[PDB]
């Protein structure tokens, strides 16, 4: 039997780990940028560091449903970026948390030491997000969020894992010469990731 990247157990485990990381990061971003009230969040522990978990079931299901669709792309190494876009009540993007991701074309079949230093890497990103409010201006009241996914290069509507996706428009993904705030860029044998924020200027 001939295997493709997605058939590798290691590719599936990494996809699981990264999808969970994105879930933790999305919850944290919503908390620190106050997209949802502090009242719905509860402090929990992840990667041995404090994080904030939404306790609103509907929001939690929405985030899981969304990220569950990114998992297969991660296994196939077809995801370039996952972006959390915060928009004001006028539907204008005010902040964009950009997670650029690159993965090797293959992973070892010798699964040993796969996630060796992964937690230290993910922890670094969470810590940066945790204090991002110190380098960003306060967002206006009534903001909402959307998640954008950029894939590796025909239907306008795509249904993945029973969840519908559509092409985003420059009407909600355009910022004229925005301020770029680097947060963290790290590399490892299984992943290279770069997180930065684009802020409306």
């Amino acid at each position: 039997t001939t295997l493709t990247r997605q058939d590798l157990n290691s590719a599936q485990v990494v996809a699981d780990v990264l999808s969970e990381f994105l879930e933790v990061a999305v919850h944290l971003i919503l908390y620190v940028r106050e997209v949802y009230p502090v009242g719905i969040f509860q402090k929990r522990k992840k990667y041995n560091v404090p994080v904030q978990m939404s306790c609103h079931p509907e929001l939690n299901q929405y985030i899981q449903d969304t990220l569950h669709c990114v998992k297969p792309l991660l296994e196939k190494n077809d995801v370039e970026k996952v972006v959390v876009v915060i928009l004001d009540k006028e539907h204008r993007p005010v902040e964009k948390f950009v997670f650029e991701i690159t993965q090797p074309p293959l992973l070892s079949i010798n699964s040993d030491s796969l996630l060796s230093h992964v937690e230290q890497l993910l922890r670094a990103f969470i810590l940066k997000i945790s204090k991002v409010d110190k380098v960003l201006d306060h967002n206006p009241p009534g903001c909402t969020f959307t998640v954008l996914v950029h894939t590796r290069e025909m239907e306008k509507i795509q249904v993945i894992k029973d969840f519908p996706w559509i092409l985003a428009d420059e009407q909600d993904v355009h910022m004229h010469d925005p301020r770029l705030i680097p947060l963290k860029t790290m590399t490892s044998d299984i992943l290279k990731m770069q997180l930065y924020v684009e802020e409306r200027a």
Binding site: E58, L59, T146, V149, H150, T151, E153, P164, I166
Partner: peptide
């Protein structure tokens, strides 16, 4: 790159939003 792609379903508001299919 392909996309960007976004969920057709908008993020839920604190309390369910209004009826507007289109």
């Amino acid at each position: 790159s392909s996309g960007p792609w976004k969920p057709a379903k908008p993020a839920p508001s604190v309390s369910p939003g209004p009826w507007k299919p289109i």
